[PDB]
Short mmCIF file of C-alpha atoms (C1' of nucleotides) in Angstrom, two decimals:
data_model
loop_
_atom_site.label_atom_id
_atom_site.label_comp_id
_atom_site.label_asym_id
_atom_site.label_seq_id
_atom_site.Cartn_x
_atom_site.Cartn_y
_atom_site.Cartn_z
CA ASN A 1 0.08 0.08 0.35
CA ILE A 2 1.35 3.25 -0.91
CA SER A 3 2.35 6.14 1.89
CA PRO A 4 0.18 9.06 1.87
CA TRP A 5 3.34 11.14 1.90
CA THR A 6 4.47 9.33 -1.24
CA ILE A 7 1.06 10.95 -2.36
CA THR A 8 1.59 14.47 -1.25
CA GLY A 9 5.10 14.59 -2.65
CA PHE A 10 4.08 13.26 -6.19
CA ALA A 11 1.04 15.68 -6.75
CA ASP A 12 3.46 18.63 -5.31
CA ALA A 13 5.19 17.44 -8.57
CA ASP A 14 2.28 17.23 -11.50
CA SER A 15 -0.93 17.90 -9.46
CA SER A 16 -3.10 21.06 -10.14
CA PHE A 17 -5.34 22.68 -8.12
CA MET A 18 -8.18 25.16 -10.34
CA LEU A 19 -11.17 27.47 -10.03
CA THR A 20 -13.24 27.66 -13.11
CA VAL A 21 -15.73 30.53 -13.63
CA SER A 22 -17.87 30.37 -16.82
CA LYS A 23 -20.60 33.15 -17.65
CA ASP A 24 -24.22 31.78 -16.86
CA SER A 25 -27.62 33.04 -17.40
CA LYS A 26 -29.39 30.53 -15.20
CA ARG A 27 -27.19 32.16 -12.05
CA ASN A 28 -28.14 35.19 -9.74
CA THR A 29 -24.37 36.76 -10.57
CA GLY A 30 -24.51 35.88 -13.99
CA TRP A 31 -21.50 33.43 -13.31
CA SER A 32 -20.68 29.76 -12.18
CA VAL A 33 -17.74 28.73 -10.44
CA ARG A 34 -16.47 25.45 -9.35
CA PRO A 35 -13.30 24.12 -7.78
CA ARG A 36 -11.38 21.29 -9.01
CA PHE A 37 -8.23 19.15 -8.17
CA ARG A 38 -6.54 17.03 -10.62
CA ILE A 39 -3.76 14.45 -11.54
CA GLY A 40 -2.52 13.50 -15.54
CA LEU A 41 0.66 11.53 -15.85
CA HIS A 42 0.73 9.35 -19.05
CA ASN A 43 -1.32 6.11 -20.07
CA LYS A 44 1.40 4.23 -19.14
CA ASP A 45 0.71 5.44 -15.30
CA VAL A 46 -2.78 5.09 -14.91
CA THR A 47 -2.17 1.96 -12.29
CA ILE A 48 -0.19 5.26 -10.26
CA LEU A 49 -3.84 6.98 -10.00
CA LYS A 50 -5.67 3.34 -9.25
CA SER A 51 -3.25 2.89 -5.86
CA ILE A 52 -4.35 7.15 -5.12
CA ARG A 53 -7.40 5.90 -5.64
CA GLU A 54 -7.17 2.92 -3.63
CA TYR A 55 -6.26 5.07 -0.92
CA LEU A 56 -8.82 7.46 -0.66
CA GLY A 57 -11.55 5.61 -1.97
CA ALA A 58 -12.55 8.67 -4.37
CA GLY A 59 -11.68 10.12 -7.46
CA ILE A 60 -12.35 9.68 -11.22
CA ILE A 61 -9.92 7.99 -13.14
CA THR A 62 -10.08 9.06 -16.78
CA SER A 63 -7.95 7.43 -20.01
CA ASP A 64 -7.69 9.04 -23.17
CA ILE A 65 -4.93 11.29 -24.92
CA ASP A 66 -3.43 10.56 -21.03
CA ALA A 67 -4.63 9.76 -17.89
CA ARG A 68 -6.12 11.85 -14.96
CA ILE A 69 -8.25 11.46 -11.47
CA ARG A 70 -9.99 13.94 -10.70
CA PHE A 71 -11.56 15.55 -8.07
CA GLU A 72 -14.68 18.05 -8.69
CA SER A 73 -17.44 17.35 -5.93
CA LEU A 74 -17.79 18.73 -2.78
CA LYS A 75 -17.14 15.37 -0.83
CA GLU A 76 -14.51 14.42 -2.84
CA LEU A 77 -12.89 17.89 -2.57
CA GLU A 78 -13.39 17.38 1.06
CA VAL A 79 -11.39 14.33 1.12
CA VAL A 80 -8.91 15.80 -0.13
CA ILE A 81 -8.63 18.87 1.61
CA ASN A 82 -8.50 16.60 4.82
CA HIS A 83 -5.84 14.75 3.29
CA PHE A 84 -3.37 17.80 2.96
CA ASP A 85 -4.39 19.09 6.05
CA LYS A 86 -3.18 15.70 7.43
CA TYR A 87 -0.53 15.54 5.23
CA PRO A 88 0.71 18.77 3.65
CA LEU A 89 2.61 19.73 0.37
CA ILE A 90 5.94 20.98 0.68
CA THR A 91 6.15 22.66 -2.36
CA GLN A 92 4.95 26.15 -3.55
CA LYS A 93 1.48 24.50 -4.57
CA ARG A 94 0.76 24.85 -0.87
CA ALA A 95 -0.21 28.38 -1.73
CA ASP A 96 -2.08 27.69 -4.37
CA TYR A 97 -3.68 24.78 -1.95
CA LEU A 98 -4.88 27.59 0.39
CA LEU A 99 -6.01 29.74 -2.39
CA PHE A 100 -8.14 27.00 -3.11
CA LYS A 101 -9.17 26.22 0.21
CA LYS A 102 -10.67 29.28 1.06
CA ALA A 103 -12.29 29.48 -2.29
CA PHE A 104 -13.89 25.88 -1.43
CA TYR A 105 -15.02 27.27 1.88
CA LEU A 106 -16.86 30.16 0.24
CA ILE A 107 -17.89 27.55 -2.37
CA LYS A 108 -19.16 25.16 0.48
CA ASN A 109 -21.20 28.00 2.19
CA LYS A 110 -23.07 29.08 -1.14
CA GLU A 111 -21.25 32.81 -0.42
CA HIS A 112 -20.45 32.50 -3.98
CA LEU A 113 -24.30 32.81 -5.09
CA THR A 114 -23.72 36.77 -4.12
CA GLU A 115 -21.62 39.39 -5.65
CA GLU A 116 -19.16 39.74 -2.52
CA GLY A 117 -18.74 36.26 -2.66
CA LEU A 118 -17.63 35.55 -6.27
CA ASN A 119 -15.54 38.86 -6.32
CA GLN A 120 -13.73 37.43 -3.41
CA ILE A 121 -13.12 34.15 -5.20
CA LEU A 122 -11.84 35.91 -8.15
CA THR A 123 -9.39 37.72 -5.71
CA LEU A 124 -8.52 34.07 -4.92
CA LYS A 125 -8.23 32.88 -8.08
CA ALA A 126 -6.35 35.73 -9.28
CA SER A 127 -3.13 34.52 -7.64
CA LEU A 128 -3.62 30.69 -8.21
CA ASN A 129 -1.86 29.46 -11.15
CA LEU A 130 -1.87 31.47 -13.94
CA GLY A 131 -4.23 33.94 -12.64
CA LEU A 132 -7.22 35.66 -14.38
CA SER A 133 -7.45 35.55 -17.84
CA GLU A 134 -7.80 38.65 -20.11
CA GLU A 135 -11.96 37.79 -20.38
CA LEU A 136 -12.29 37.78 -16.74
CA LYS A 137 -10.19 41.28 -16.21
CA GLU A 138 -12.66 42.72 -19.00
CA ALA A 139 -15.57 41.53 -17.06
CA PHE A 140 -14.26 41.81 -13.46
CA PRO A 141 -12.06 45.10 -13.50
CA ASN A 142 -10.23 46.76 -10.85
CA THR A 143 -9.88 43.28 -9.24
CA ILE A 144 -7.07 42.63 -6.59
CA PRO A 145 -5.63 39.35 -6.04
CA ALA A 146 -5.40 38.07 -2.59
CA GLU A 147 -2.30 38.08 -0.73
CA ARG A 148 -0.52 34.59 -1.96
CA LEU A 149 1.74 32.31 1.19
CA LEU A 150 5.51 32.60 0.03
CA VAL A 151 6.21 29.36 1.10
CA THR A 152 9.71 29.24 3.18
CA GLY A 153 11.60 27.25 5.78
CA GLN A 154 9.84 23.99 4.76
CA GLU A 155 11.18 20.52 6.00
CA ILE A 156 11.52 17.22 3.83
CA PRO A 157 8.66 15.40 6.03
CA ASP A 158 9.26 12.05 4.65
CA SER A 159 12.13 10.17 2.61
CA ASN A 160 8.62 8.62 0.66
CA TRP A 161 7.64 12.20 -0.07
CA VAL A 162 10.78 12.03 -1.60
CA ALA A 163 10.11 9.28 -3.54
CA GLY A 164 7.10 10.57 -4.77
CA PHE A 165 8.56 14.06 -5.90
CA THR A 166 11.33 12.16 -7.61
CA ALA A 167 8.90 10.09 -9.08
CA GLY A 168 7.51 12.95 -10.59
CA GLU A 169 10.34 15.52 -11.05
CA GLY A 170 12.95 13.32 -11.22
CA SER A 171 15.07 12.30 -14.18
CA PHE A 172 17.88 9.30 -14.29
CA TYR A 173 19.78 9.43 -17.26
CA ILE A 174 22.96 8.51 -18.80
CA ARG A 175 25.17 11.13 -20.68
CA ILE A 176 28.10 10.07 -22.89
CA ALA A 177 30.07 13.53 -24.63
CA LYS A 178 32.31 12.81 -27.57
CA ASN A 179 35.60 13.44 -25.84
CA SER A 180 38.86 12.61 -27.82
CA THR A 181 41.18 12.53 -24.93
CA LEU A 182 39.35 9.43 -23.32
CA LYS A 183 40.15 5.97 -24.90
CA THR A 184 36.62 5.20 -26.11
CA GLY A 185 36.52 8.23 -27.20
CA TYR A 186 33.73 9.17 -25.25
CA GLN A 187 33.02 10.33 -21.51
CA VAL A 188 30.30 8.37 -19.70
CA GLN A 189 28.86 9.72 -16.72
CA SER A 190 25.65 8.43 -14.86
CA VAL A 191 23.30 11.45 -13.81
CA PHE A 192 20.28 11.87 -11.11
CA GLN A 193 18.76 15.37 -11.54
CA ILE A 194 15.89 16.60 -10.08
CA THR A 195 14.40 20.03 -11.88
CA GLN A 196 11.98 22.87 -10.79
CA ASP A 197 11.14 26.44 -11.25
CA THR A 198 13.51 29.39 -9.84
CA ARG A 199 11.23 29.15 -6.69
CA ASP A 200 11.92 26.64 -4.51
CA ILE A 201 15.24 26.53 -3.91
CA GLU A 202 15.15 27.19 0.02
CA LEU A 203 13.83 23.46 -0.64
CA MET A 204 16.34 22.30 -3.19
CA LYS A 205 19.45 22.99 -0.97
CA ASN A 206 17.36 20.79 1.83
CA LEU A 207 16.84 18.36 -0.48
CA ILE A 208 20.27 18.43 -1.48
CA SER A 209 21.48 18.45 2.85
CA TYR A 210 18.87 15.12 3.17
CA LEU A 211 20.34 13.33 0.76
CA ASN A 212 23.59 15.14 1.34
CA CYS A 213 24.50 15.25 -1.92
CA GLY A 214 24.15 17.30 -5.39
CA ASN A 215 25.02 20.53 -6.71
CA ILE A 216 22.64 23.48 -8.08
CA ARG A 217 22.69 24.56 -11.16
CA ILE A 218 20.61 27.56 -12.50
CA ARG A 219 19.53 27.84 -15.98
CA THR A 220 14.52 30.54 -15.09
CA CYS A 221 14.78 26.92 -13.87
CA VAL A 222 17.08 25.51 -11.43
CA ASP A 223 18.66 21.86 -11.32
CA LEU A 224 19.75 19.51 -8.50
CA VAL A 225 22.51 17.36 -10.30
CA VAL A 226 23.72 14.45 -8.83
CA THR A 227 27.38 13.25 -10.71
CA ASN A 228 29.43 11.97 -8.39
CA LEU A 229 29.68 8.09 -8.93
CA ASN A 230 30.02 7.14 -5.33
CA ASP A 231 27.44 9.34 -3.94
CA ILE A 232 24.86 7.62 -6.99
CA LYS A 233 26.50 4.29 -5.46
CA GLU A 234 26.50 5.00 -1.48
CA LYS A 235 23.85 7.35 -1.11
CA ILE A 236 21.37 7.45 -3.87
CA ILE A 237 20.47 4.14 -5.23
CA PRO A 238 20.17 2.71 -1.42
CA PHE A 239 17.53 5.34 -0.68
CA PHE A 240 15.63 4.43 -3.77
CA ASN A 241 16.18 1.04 -2.95
CA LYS A 242 14.25 1.46 0.31
CA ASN A 243 12.02 4.24 -0.95
CA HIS A 244 10.18 3.42 -4.07
CA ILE A 245 10.36 5.01 -7.51
CA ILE A 246 6.84 4.27 -8.81
CA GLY A 247 5.67 4.36 -12.35
CA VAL A 248 7.57 3.59 -15.72
CA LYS A 249 10.58 5.97 -14.25
CA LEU A 250 11.13 2.60 -11.65
CA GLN A 251 12.28 0.56 -14.89
CA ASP A 252 13.81 3.31 -16.37
CA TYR A 253 15.60 3.74 -12.62
CA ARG A 254 16.46 0.09 -12.83
CA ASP A 255 18.30 0.51 -16.05
CA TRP A 256 19.85 3.27 -14.75
CA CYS A 257 21.18 1.38 -11.58
CA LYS A 258 22.63 -1.50 -14.24
CA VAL A 259 24.77 0.87 -16.12
CA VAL A 260 25.62 2.49 -13.09
CA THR A 261 27.05 -1.27 -11.92
CA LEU A 262 28.59 -1.79 -15.41
CA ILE A 263 30.31 1.64 -15.03
CA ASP A 264 31.53 0.64 -11.05
CA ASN A 265 33.34 -2.03 -12.74
CA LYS A 266 34.72 -0.14 -15.23
CA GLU A 267 33.17 -1.59 -17.99
CA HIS A 268 32.38 1.52 -19.84
CA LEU A 269 36.01 2.05 -20.86
CA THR A 270 36.02 -0.40 -23.35
CA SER A 271 34.58 -0.18 -26.50
CA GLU A 272 32.28 -3.22 -26.14
CA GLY A 273 30.76 -2.18 -23.16
CA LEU A 274 30.38 1.19 -24.50
CA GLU A 275 28.00 -0.49 -27.22
CA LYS A 276 26.49 -2.03 -24.55
CA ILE A 277 25.51 1.19 -22.70
CA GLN A 278 24.49 3.22 -25.63
CA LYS A 279 22.26 0.57 -26.97
CA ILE A 280 20.68 0.23 -22.96
CA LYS A 281 20.84 4.58 -23.27
CA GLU A 282 18.72 4.21 -26.22
CA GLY A 283 16.14 2.10 -24.36
CA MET A 284 15.37 4.37 -21.49
CA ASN A 285 13.46 7.21 -20.88
CA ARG A 286 12.33 8.79 -24.21
CA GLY A 287 13.23 6.25 -25.94
CA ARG A 288 11.09 3.86 -24.74
CA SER A 289 8.75 2.06 -26.76
"C1'" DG B 1 51.46 14.85 -21.50
"C1'" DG B 2 47.87 11.10 -20.95
"C1'" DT B 3 43.77 9.56 -18.98
"C1'" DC B 4 40.14 10.15 -16.23
"C1'" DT B 5 36.24 12.06 -13.42
"C1'" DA B 6 33.34 16.21 -11.59
"C1'" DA B 7 30.32 19.93 -12.96
"C1'" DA B 8 29.82 23.90 -15.28
"C1'" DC B 9 27.55 25.33 -19.33
"C1'" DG B 10 24.31 24.90 -23.63
"C1'" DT B 11 19.48 23.95 -25.14
"C1'" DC B 12 15.65 21.34 -27.73
"C1'" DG B 13 10.71 18.77 -28.14
"C1'" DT B 14 6.47 17.06 -25.94
"C1'" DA B 15 4.25 15.21 -22.64
"C1'" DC C 1 -35.99 25.80 -12.46
"C1'" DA C 2 -30.80 26.49 -11.30
"C1'" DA C 3 -27.69 24.47 -8.92
"C1'" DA C 4 -24.02 20.60 -8.97
"C1'" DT C 5 -21.20 18.19 -11.45
"C1'" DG C 6 -20.26 14.23 -14.87
"C1'" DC C 7 -17.69 14.69 -19.21
"C1'" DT C 8 -14.54 15.88 -22.58
"C1'" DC C 9 -11.88 18.76 -25.36
"C1'" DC C 10 -8.17 23.03 -26.12
"C1'" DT C 11 -3.70 25.33 -25.82
"C1'" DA C 12 1.40 25.78 -25.22
"C1'" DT C 13 5.34 25.72 -22.21
"C1'" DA C 14 7.99 24.43 -17.21
"C1'" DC C 15 9.91 21.03 -17.87
"C1'" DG C 16 12.70 16.51 -18.08
"C1'" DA C 17 16.33 14.86 -21.03
"C1'" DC C 18 20.26 15.19 -24.16
"C1'" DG C 19 24.75 17.21 -25.87
"C1'" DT C 20 29.11 19.92 -25.34
"C1'" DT C 21 33.38 22.04 -22.90
"C1'" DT C 22 36.19 22.71 -18.61
"C1'" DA C 23 38.75 22.87 -14.26
"C1'" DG C 24 41.48 19.74 -12.18
"C1'" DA C 25 43.23 15.45 -9.88
"C1'" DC C 26 46.23 11.48 -10.61
"C1'" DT D 1 2.86 17.08 -18.65
"C1'" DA D 2 0.29 21.69 -15.98
"C1'" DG D 3 -3.26 24.61 -17.07
"C1'" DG D 4 -7.07 25.58 -18.80
"C1'" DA D 5 -12.48 26.22 -20.72
"C1'" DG D 6 -17.41 24.80 -21.03
"C1'" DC D 7 -21.50 21.70 -23.37
"C1'" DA D 8 -24.10 17.87 -21.03
"C1'" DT D 9 -26.26 15.34 -17.85
"C1'" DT D 10 -27.79 14.92 -13.21
"C1'" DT D 11 -29.55 15.72 -8.84
#
DNA sequence: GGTCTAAACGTCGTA
DNA sequence: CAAATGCTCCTATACGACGTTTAGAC
DNA sequence: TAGGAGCATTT
């Protein structure tokens, strides 16, 4: 059975909290307002959603161009809020969550059926995700956006949180560089990486502290990068062996481990072994069918 | 000087 | 009835993931 | 992915 913190970490990576405000003649305010919580991933990972569904006893699963689990009814969203109240997010999405949570309450209490409550909801939405559209700005001018929590000083709550987060945002890849100064003509590097927009760096340094390795690379986005071979060998691999990666990325992880094994035994320093590794790499990640 | 590891630096396409 | 929400389709860019060059240990 | 918008159906 999946851990709640794994769920929170994974949602921390890939999930979305949303508020839809659509023009509607039938409403007294002229507008329809509704809250949503959703996770999308890839058809190949429908099983992950089922585990979440199995955990919560709630959520609607769909599969088409992608795989999604959604929470749209008040009871289900109530379940979601109860969960994150018990097992809180630690990325910036917590702030979105908090905006979402305020709106939900406004909606739960039917205060959204007033001009006042509707306007307040828009103040919440303005700071939520992408904020208010041009159309909504046009329809509701002089809207002042609700204050948004800057999330800071947050501790890693649990190793399984890390497993879920890495299952969302992490990457295990093999870097091959053409380089004449090597006998094989190529440098081979095993790389572990986590990518995130420039906003949770306090958190990122904390992941470095928690795993006790890696460096920060800044490009709009920040990367946590582990390249040290026996940091990978003596820190990362035991960690994810105990704290399991979920989804197809688990398989990519396994292949990555295998190549790390080959590298440790210096097989990357031979032509045949280099061909082997190239062959494995070609079957990893995006090249996986 | 040769070989190598680590990582700083560069950057494209679809999920 | 209109309020809630079931259900489906649309858009495009934060992402993952792939490549090269440099500092420097041995 | 991430976030989005809106018609159809149920309550």
